[PDB]
mmCIF file of all heavy atoms in Angstrom:
data_model
loop_
_atom_site.group_PDB
_atom_site.id
_atom_site.type_symbol
_atom_site.label_atom_id
_atom_site.label_comp_id
_atom_site.label_asym_id
_atom_site.label_seq_id
_atom_site.Cartn_x
_atom_site.Cartn_y
_atom_site.Cartn_z
ATOM 1 N N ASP A 1 72.442 4.239 74.176
ATOM 2 C CA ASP A 1 71.269 5.084 73.968
ATOM 3 C C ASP A 1 71.377 6.269 74.917
ATOM 4 O O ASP A 1 70.425 6.636 75.605
ATOM 5 C CB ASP A 1 70.005 4.277 74.261
ATOM 6 C CG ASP A 1 69.946 2.983 73.464
ATOM 7 O OD1 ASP A 1 70.512 2.939 72.345
ATOM 8 O OD2 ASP A 1 69.330 2.011 73.956
ATOM 9 N N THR A 2 72.559 6.866 74.925
ATOM 10 C CA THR A 2 72.871 7.977 75.808
ATOM 11 C C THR A 2 73.912 8.829 75.092
ATOM 12 O O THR A 2 74.705 8.301 74.315
ATOM 13 C CB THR A 2 73.469 7.423 77.120
ATOM 14 O OG1 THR A 2 72.422 6.911 77.952
ATOM 15 C CG2 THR A 2 74.210 8.464 77.848
ATOM 16 N N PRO A 3 73.920 10.155 75.332
ATOM 17 C CA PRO A 3 74.902 11.036 74.680
ATOM 18 C C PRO A 3 76.315 10.591 75.042
ATOM 19 O O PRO A 3 77.294 10.972 74.392
ATOM 20 C CB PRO A 3 74.584 12.412 75.263
ATOM 21 C CG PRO A 3 73.128 12.324 75.560
ATOM 22 C CD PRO A 3 72.986 10.938 76.156
ATOM 23 N N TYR A 4 76.399 9.770 76.086
ATOM 24 C CA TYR A 4 77.668 9.254 76.577
ATOM 25 C C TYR A 4 78.053 7.924 75.938
ATOM 26 O O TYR A 4 79.130 7.398 76.197
ATOM 27 C CB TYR A 4 77.598 9.114 78.097
ATOM 28 C CG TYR A 4 77.006 10.338 78.760
ATOM 29 C CD1 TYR A 4 75.757 10.281 79.377
ATOM 30 C CD2 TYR A 4 77.666 11.572 78.713
ATOM 31 C CE1 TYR A 4 75.169 11.408 79.924
ATOM 32 C CE2 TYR A 4 77.087 12.709 79.261
ATOM 33 C CZ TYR A 4 75.836 12.616 79.861
ATOM 34 O OH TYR A 4 75.242 13.728 80.395
ATOM 35 N N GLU A 5 77.177 7.384 75.097
ATOM 36 C CA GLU A 5 77.452 6.126 74.415
ATOM 37 C C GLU A 5 78.685 6.250 73.509
ATOM 38 O O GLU A 5 78.760 7.131 72.653
ATOM 39 C CB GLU A 5 76.256 5.711 73.568
ATOM 40 C CG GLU A 5 76.258 4.237 73.240
ATOM 41 C CD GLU A 5 75.324 3.883 72.101
ATOM 42 O OE1 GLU A 5 74.140 4.273 72.148
ATOM 43 O OE2 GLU A 5 75.776 3.204 71.156
ATOM 44 N N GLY A 6 79.646 5.356 73.692
ATOM 45 C CA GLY A 6 80.852 5.401 72.890
ATOM 46 C C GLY A 6 81.983 5.966 73.719
ATOM 47 O O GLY A 6 83.166 5.780 73.406
ATOM 48 N N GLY A 7 81.601 6.659 74.788
ATOM 49 C CA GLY A 7 82.573 7.255 75.680
ATOM 50 C C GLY A 7 83.028 6.349 76.817
ATOM 51 O O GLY A 7 82.326 5.411 77.237
ATOM 52 N N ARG A 8 84.236 6.647 77.290
ATOM 53 C CA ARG A 8 84.892 5.950 78.386
ATOM 54 C C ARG A 8 85.286 7.065 79.347
ATOM 55 O O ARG A 8 85.946 8.035 78.943
ATOM 56 C CB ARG A 8 86.140 5.216 77.886
ATOM 57 C CG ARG A 8 85.852 4.092 76.907
ATOM 58 C CD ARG A 8 87.116 3.367 76.503
ATOM 59 N NE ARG A 8 86.888 2.496 75.355
ATOM 60 C CZ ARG A 8 87.829 1.756 74.782
ATOM 61 N NH1 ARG A 8 89.072 1.772 75.252
ATOM 62 N NH2 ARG A 8 87.531 1.020 73.721
ATOM 63 N N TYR A 9 84.888 6.921 80.611
ATOM 64 C CA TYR A 9 85.136 7.944 81.622
ATOM 65 C C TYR A 9 86.021 7.523 82.780
ATOM 66 O O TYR A 9 85.653 6.641 83.560
ATOM 67 C CB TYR A 9 83.771 8.441 82.153
ATOM 68 C CG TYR A 9 82.984 9.070 81.034
ATOM 69 C CD1 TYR A 9 82.013 8.344 80.329
ATOM 70 C CD2 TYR A 9 83.232 10.389 80.635
ATOM 71 C CE1 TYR A 9 81.346 8.904 79.232
ATOM 72 C CE2 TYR A 9 82.574 10.950 79.548
ATOM 73 C CZ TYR A 9 81.638 10.208 78.851
ATOM 74 O OH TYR A 9 80.981 10.795 77.786
ATOM 75 N N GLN A 10 87.183 8.162 82.902
ATOM 76 C CA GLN A 10 88.104 7.851 83.992
ATOM 77 C C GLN A 10 87.697 8.547 85.280
ATOM 78 O O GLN A 10 87.278 9.700 85.278
ATOM 79 C CB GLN A 10 89.534 8.229 83.619
ATOM 80 C CG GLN A 10 90.036 7.427 82.442
ATOM 81 C CD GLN A 10 91.484 7.678 82.127
ATOM 82 O OE1 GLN A 10 91.947 7.363 81.030
ATOM 83 N NE2 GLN A 10 92.218 8.239 83.085
ATOM 84 N N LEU A 11 87.823 7.817 86.382
ATOM 85 C CA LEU A 11 87.441 8.324 87.691
ATOM 86 C C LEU A 11 88.648 8.394 88.607
ATOM 87 O O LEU A 11 89.659 7.753 88.367
ATOM 88 C CB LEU A 11 86.367 7.408 88.302
ATOM 89 C CG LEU A 11 85.095 7.233 87.462
ATOM 90 C CD1 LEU A 11 84.314 6.004 87.908
ATOM 91 C CD2 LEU A 11 84.247 8.487 87.576
ATOM 92 N N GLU A 12 88.545 9.202 89.647
ATOM 93 C CA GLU A 12 89.613 9.333 90.629
ATOM 94 C C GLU A 12 88.973 8.822 91.911
ATOM 95 O O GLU A 12 88.050 9.437 92.430
ATOM 96 C CB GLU A 12 90.016 10.796 90.776
ATOM 97 C CG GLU A 12 91.058 11.067 91.831
ATOM 98 C CD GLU A 12 91.364 12.545 91.938
ATOM 99 O OE1 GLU A 12 90.485 13.306 92.390
ATOM 100 O OE2 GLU A 12 92.478 12.953 91.556
ATOM 101 N N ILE A 13 89.427 7.673 92.395
ATOM 102 C CA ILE A 13 88.854 7.106 93.613
ATOM 103 C C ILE A 13 89.822 7.292 94.773
ATOM 104 O O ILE A 13 90.957 6.833 94.726
ATOM 105 C CB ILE A 13 88.574 5.570 93.482
ATOM 106 C CG1 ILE A 13 88.007 5.228 92.097
ATOM 107 C CG2 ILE A 13 87.629 5.125 94.593
ATOM 108 C CD1 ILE A 13 86.728 5.914 91.776
ATOM 109 N N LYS A 14 89.385 7.981 95.811
ATOM 110 C CA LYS A 14 90.239 8.160 96.963
ATOM 111 C C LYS A 14 89.525 7.499 98.124
ATOM 112 O O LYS A 14 88.433 7.915 98.516
ATOM 113 C CB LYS A 14 90.492 9.640 97.220
ATOM 114 C CG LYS A 14 91.515 10.236 96.268
ATOM 115 C CD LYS A 14 91.715 11.706 96.538
ATOM 116 C CE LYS A 14 92.910 12.243 95.778
ATOM 117 N NZ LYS A 14 93.171 13.676 96.107
ATOM 118 N N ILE A 15 90.136 6.435 98.641
ATOM 119 C CA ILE A 15 89.568 5.678 99.746
ATOM 120 C C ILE A 15 89.840 6.348 101.093
ATOM 121 O O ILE A 15 90.976 6.720 101.405
ATOM 122 C CB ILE A 15 90.137 4.242 99.766
ATOM 123 C CG1 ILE A 15 89.850 3.554 98.425
ATOM 124 C CG2 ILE A 15 89.553 3.458 100.928
ATOM 125 C CD1 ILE A 15 88.377 3.463 98.029
ATOM 126 N N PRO A 16 88.785 6.541 101.899
ATOM 127 C CA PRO A 16 88.987 7.173 103.211
ATOM 128 C C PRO A 16 89.475 6.194 104.293
ATOM 129 O O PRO A 16 89.142 5.001 104.270
ATOM 130 C CB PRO A 16 87.609 7.763 103.528
ATOM 131 C CG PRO A 16 86.666 6.796 102.866
ATOM 132 C CD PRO A 16 87.352 6.476 101.545
ATOM 133 N N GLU A 17 90.273 6.720 105.223
ATOM 134 C CA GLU A 17 90.822 5.965 106.348
ATOM 135 C C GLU A 17 89.721 5.260 107.137
ATOM 136 O O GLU A 17 89.975 4.264 107.821
ATOM 137 C CB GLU A 17 91.575 6.911 107.291
ATOM 138 C CG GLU A 17 92.925 7.400 106.781
ATOM 139 C CD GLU A 17 94.051 6.403 107.024
ATOM 140 O OE1 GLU A 17 93.819 5.390 107.723
ATOM 141 O OE2 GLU A 17 95.174 6.631 106.528
ATOM 142 N N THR A 18 88.505 5.791 107.040
ATOM 143 C CA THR A 18 87.343 5.246 107.742
ATOM 144 C C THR A 18 86.569 4.156 106.975
ATOM 145 O O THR A 18 85.579 3.616 107.487
ATOM 146 C CB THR A 18 86.364 6.373 108.084
ATOM 147 O OG1 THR A 18 86.152 7.168 106.911
ATOM 148 C CG2 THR A 18 86.920 7.251 109.206
ATOM 149 N N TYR A 19 87.011 3.848 105.755
ATOM 150 C CA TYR A 19 86.369 2.826 104.929
ATOM 151 C C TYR A 19 86.251 1.541 105.760
ATOM 152 O O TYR A 19 87.163 1.211 106.514
ATOM 153 C CB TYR A 19 87.226 2.559 103.685
ATOM 154 C CG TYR A 19 86.431 2.034 102.506
ATOM 155 C CD1 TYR A 19 85.586 2.881 101.789
ATOM 156 C CD2 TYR A 19 86.512 0.694 102.113
ATOM 157 C CE1 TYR A 19 84.844 2.414 100.713
ATOM 158 C CE2 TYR A 19 85.772 0.218 101.041
ATOM 159 C CZ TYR A 19 84.940 1.087 100.343
ATOM 160 O OH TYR A 19 84.217 0.654 99.256
ATOM 161 N N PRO A 20 85.168 0.755 105.625
ATOM 162 C CA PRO A 20 83.951 0.877 104.778
ATOM 163 C C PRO A 20 82.800 1.690 105.353
ATOM 164 O O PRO A 20 81.709 1.707 104.773
ATOM 165 C CB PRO A 20 83.531 -0.572 104.650
ATOM 166 C CG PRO A 20 83.769 -1.067 106.077
ATOM 167 C CD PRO A 20 85.169 -0.530 106.316
ATOM 168 N N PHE A 21 83.024 2.352 106.484
ATOM 169 C CA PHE A 21 81.955 3.095 107.145
ATOM 170 C C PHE A 21 81.650 4.446 106.523
ATOM 171 O O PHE A 21 80.619 5.065 106.811
ATOM 172 C CB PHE A 21 82.278 3.194 108.637
ATOM 173 C CG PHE A 21 82.508 1.851 109.266
ATOM 174 C CD1 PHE A 21 83.736 1.533 109.836
ATOM 175 C CD2 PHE A 21 81.509 0.867 109.209
ATOM 176 C CE1 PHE A 21 83.971 0.249 110.339
ATOM 177 C CE2 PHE A 21 81.729 -0.428 109.709
ATOM 178 C CZ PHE A 21 82.960 -0.741 110.274
ATOM 179 N N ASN A 22 82.545 4.878 105.645
ATOM 180 C CA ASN A 22 82.377 6.122 104.918
ATOM 181 C C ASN A 22 82.668 5.825 103.460
ATOM 182 O O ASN A 22 83.440 4.926 103.156
ATOM 183 C CB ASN A 22 83.305 7.198 105.467
ATOM 184 C CG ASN A 22 82.761 7.811 106.723
ATOM 185 O OD1 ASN A 22 83.396 7.784 107.772
ATOM 186 N ND2 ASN A 22 81.559 8.359 106.631
ATOM 187 N N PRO A 23 82.038 6.569 102.539
ATOM 188 C CA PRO A 23 82.218 6.384 101.098
ATOM 189 C C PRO A 23 83.520 6.932 100.557
ATOM 190 O O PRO A 23 84.159 7.762 101.191
ATOM 191 C CB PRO A 23 81.028 7.135 100.516
ATOM 192 C CG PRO A 23 80.936 8.322 101.449
ATOM 193 C CD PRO A 23 81.080 7.661 102.810
ATOM 194 N N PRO A 24 83.937 6.460 99.374
ATOM 195 C CA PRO A 24 85.176 6.956 98.774
ATOM 196 C C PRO A 24 84.833 8.297 98.121
ATOM 197 O O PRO A 24 83.658 8.576 97.858
ATOM 198 C CB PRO A 24 85.496 5.899 97.730
ATOM 199 C CG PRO A 24 84.136 5.514 97.246
ATOM 200 C CD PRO A 24 83.336 5.400 98.540
ATOM 201 N N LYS A 25 85.837 9.137 97.893
ATOM 202 C CA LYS A 25 85.604 10.412 97.227
ATOM 203 C C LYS A 25 85.798 10.140 95.744
ATOM 204 O O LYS A 25 86.904 9.832 95.306
ATOM 205 C CB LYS A 25 86.599 11.475 97.692
ATOM 206 C CG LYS A 25 86.219 12.186 98.983
ATOM 207 C CD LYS A 25 87.234 13.298 99.275
ATOM 208 C CE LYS A 25 86.913 14.108 100.540
ATOM 209 N NZ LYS A 25 87.875 15.254 100.715
ATOM 210 N N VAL A 26 84.723 10.231 94.972
ATOM 211 C CA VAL A 26 84.814 9.971 93.541
ATOM 212 C C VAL A 26 84.649 11.259 92.731
ATOM 213 O O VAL A 26 83.835 12.125 93.066
ATOM 214 C CB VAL A 26 83.765 8.907 93.089
ATOM 215 C CG1 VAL A 26 84.055 8.465 91.660
ATOM 216 C CG2 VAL A 26 83.814 7.700 94.015
ATOM 217 N N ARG A 27 85.422 11.366 91.656
ATOM 218 C CA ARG A 27 85.415 12.545 90.811
ATOM 219 C C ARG A 27 85.742 12.133 89.381
ATOM 220 O O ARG A 27 86.599 11.284 89.179
ATOM 221 C CB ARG A 27 86.492 13.500 91.336
ATOM 222 C CG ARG A 27 86.484 14.895 90.777
ATOM 223 C CD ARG A 27 87.631 15.666 91.378
ATOM 224 N NE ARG A 27 88.912 15.213 90.853
ATOM 225 C CZ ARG A 27 89.364 15.503 89.632
ATOM 226 N NH1 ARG A 27 88.637 16.250 88.812
ATOM 227 N NH2 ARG A 27 90.545 15.047 89.226
ATOM 228 N N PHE A 28 85.078 12.735 88.390
ATOM 229 C CA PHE A 28 85.349 12.413 86.983
ATOM 230 C C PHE A 28 86.621 13.088 86.528
ATOM 231 O O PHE A 28 86.766 14.298 86.665
ATOM 232 C CB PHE A 28 84.207 12.869 86.062
ATOM 233 C CG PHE A 28 83.084 11.872 85.930
ATOM 234 C CD1 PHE A 28 82.281 11.558 87.018
ATOM 235 C CD2 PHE A 28 82.818 11.262 84.715
ATOM 236 C CE1 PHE A 28 81.222 10.653 86.900
ATOM 237 C CE2 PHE A 28 81.760 10.350 84.583
ATOM 238 C CZ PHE A 28 80.963 10.050 85.680
ATOM 239 N N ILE A 29 87.550 12.297 85.994
ATOM 240 C CA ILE A 29 88.816 12.821 85.483
ATOM 241 C C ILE A 29 88.528 13.294 84.061
ATOM 242 O O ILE A 29 89.017 14.328 83.619
ATOM 243 C CB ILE A 29 89.913 11.723 85.420
ATOM 244 C CG1 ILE A 29 90.168 11.135 86.807
ATOM 245 C CG2 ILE A 29 91.203 12.311 84.867
ATOM 246 C CD1 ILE A 29 90.618 12.142 87.821
ATOM 247 N N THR A 30 87.720 12.507 83.358
ATOM 248 C CA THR A 30 87.324 12.792 81.989
ATOM 249 C C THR A 30 86.182 13.802 82.065
ATOM 250 O O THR A 30 85.191 13.569 82.783
ATOM 251 C CB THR A 30 86.832 11.496 81.299
ATOM 252 O OG1 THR A 30 87.844 10.489 81.417
ATOM 253 C CG2 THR A 30 86.539 11.733 79.824
ATOM 254 N N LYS A 31 86.322 14.922 81.344
ATOM 255 C CA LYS A 31 85.288 15.955 81.346
ATOM 256 C C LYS A 31 83.995 15.401 80.772
ATOM 257 O O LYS A 31 84.001 14.686 79.771
ATOM 258 C CB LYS A 31 85.731 17.185 80.550
ATOM 259 C CG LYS A 31 86.746 18.059 81.270
ATOM 260 C CD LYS A 31 87.295 19.126 80.343
ATOM 261 C CE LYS A 31 88.545 19.776 80.917
ATOM 262 N NZ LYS A 31 88.281 20.411 82.240
ATOM 263 N N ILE A 32 82.885 15.748 81.418
ATOM 264 C CA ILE A 32 81.569 15.284 81.015
ATOM 265 C C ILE A 32 80.575 16.432 81.203
ATOM 266 O O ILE A 32 80.807 17.335 82.010
ATOM 267 C CB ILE A 32 81.148 14.041 81.888
ATOM 268 C CG1 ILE A 32 79.872 13.398 81.337
ATOM 269 C CG2 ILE A 32 80.949 14.470 83.354
ATOM 270 C CD1 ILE A 32 79.545 12.048 81.940
ATOM 271 N N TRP A 33 79.482 16.396 80.440
ATOM 272 C CA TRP A 33 78.420 17.408 80.517
ATOM 273 C C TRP A 33 77.180 16.671 81.041
ATOM 274 O O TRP A 33 76.481 16.011 80.277
ATOM 275 C CB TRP A 33 78.170 18.013 79.118
ATOM 276 C CG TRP A 33 77.223 19.195 79.086
ATOM 277 C CD1 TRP A 33 75.910 19.186 78.684
ATOM 278 C CD2 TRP A 33 77.508 20.549 79.492
ATOM 279 N NE1 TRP A 33 75.365 20.447 78.814
ATOM 280 C CE2 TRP A 33 76.322 21.301 79.309
ATOM 281 C CE3 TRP A 33 78.647 21.200 79.993
ATOM 282 C CZ2 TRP A 33 76.244 22.675 79.611
ATOM 283 C CZ3 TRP A 33 78.568 22.568 80.291
ATOM 284 C CH2 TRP A 33 77.371 23.286 80.098
ATOM 285 N N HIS A 34 76.921 16.794 82.346
ATOM 286 C CA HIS A 34 75.816 16.099 83.017
ATOM 287 C C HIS A 34 75.259 16.957 84.163
ATOM 288 O O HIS A 34 76.015 17.636 84.860
ATOM 289 C CB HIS A 34 76.351 14.763 83.583
ATOM 290 C CG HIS A 34 75.295 13.854 84.144
ATOM 291 N ND1 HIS A 34 74.772 12.791 83.438
ATOM 292 C CD2 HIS A 34 74.676 13.840 85.351
ATOM 293 C CE1 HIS A 34 73.880 12.162 84.184
ATOM 294 N NE2 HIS A 34 73.803 12.778 85.349
ATOM 295 N N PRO A 35 73.931 16.920 84.392
ATOM 296 C CA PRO A 35 73.324 17.715 85.473
ATOM 297 C C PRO A 35 73.949 17.503 86.853
ATOM 298 O O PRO A 35 74.153 18.465 87.594
ATOM 299 C CB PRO A 35 71.858 17.272 85.460
ATOM 300 C CG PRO A 35 71.627 16.875 84.049
ATOM 301 C CD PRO A 35 72.898 16.137 83.683
ATOM 302 N N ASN A 36 74.259 16.244 87.179
ATOM 303 C CA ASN A 36 74.815 15.857 88.478
ATOM 304 C C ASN A 36 76.328 15.786 88.600
ATOM 305 O O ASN A 36 76.857 15.243 89.576
ATOM 306 C CB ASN A 36 74.231 14.513 88.885
ATOM 307 C CG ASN A 36 72.735 14.490 88.777
ATOM 308 O OD1 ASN A 36 72.180 13.982 87.806
ATOM 309 N ND2 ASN A 36 72.066 15.071 89.763
ATOM 310 N N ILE A 37 77.026 16.338 87.621
ATOM 311 C CA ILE A 37 78.476 16.329 87.640
ATOM 312 C C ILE A 37 78.953 17.710 87.226
ATOM 313 O O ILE A 37 78.454 18.273 86.254
ATOM 314 C CB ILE A 37 79.019 15.278 86.652
ATOM 315 C CG1 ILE A 37 78.419 13.909 86.980
ATOM 316 C CG2 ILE A 37 80.527 15.226 86.709
ATOM 317 C CD1 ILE A 37 78.659 12.863 85.919
ATOM 318 N N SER A 38 79.898 18.268 87.971
ATOM 319 C CA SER A 38 80.421 19.586 87.642
ATOM 320 C C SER A 38 81.206 19.556 86.337
ATOM 321 O O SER A 38 82.200 18.837 86.215
ATOM 322 C CB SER A 38 81.324 20.097 88.750
ATOM 323 O OG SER A 38 82.167 21.105 88.235
ATOM 324 N N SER A 39 80.764 20.344 85.364
ATOM 325 C CA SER A 39 81.432 20.403 84.072
ATOM 326 C C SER A 39 82.808 21.061 84.175
ATOM 327 O O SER A 39 83.505 21.206 83.172
ATOM 328 C CB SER A 39 80.573 21.180 83.073
ATOM 329 O OG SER A 39 80.482 22.546 83.445
ATOM 330 N N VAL A 40 83.201 21.451 85.383
ATOM 331 C CA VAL A 40 84.495 22.108 85.579
ATOM 332 C C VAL A 40 85.446 21.313 86.454
ATOM 333 O O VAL A 40 86.633 21.230 86.163
ATOM 334 C CB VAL A 40 84.333 23.511 86.226
ATOM 335 C CG1 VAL A 40 85.692 24.133 86.478
ATOM 336 C CG2 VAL A 40 83.498 24.404 85.325
#
């Protein structure tokens, strides 16, 4: 029940040397059109 329904989105997870005290750097590999994600 989302414009993204049917879609599969690949992510790029880069774990920081400081893990678990700092978050991983996540980025969408698969292009998506969303307010909180850069369409570029």
Side-chain angles (χ1 to χ4, degrees):
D1 306 331
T2 282
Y4 314 111
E5 200 196 309
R8 295 183 193 179
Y9 298 97
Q10 297 185 198
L11 303 162
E12 176 182 69
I13 320 300
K14 283 179 169 184
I15 303 302
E17 286 278 352
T18 48
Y19 206 73
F21 305 118
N22 280 122
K25 276 185 178 185
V26 191
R27 191 182 72 75
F28 274 66
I29 301 300
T30 306
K31 284 171 194 301
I32 189 169
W33 187 257
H34 188 99
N36 310 100
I37 304 168
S38 160
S39 67
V40 177

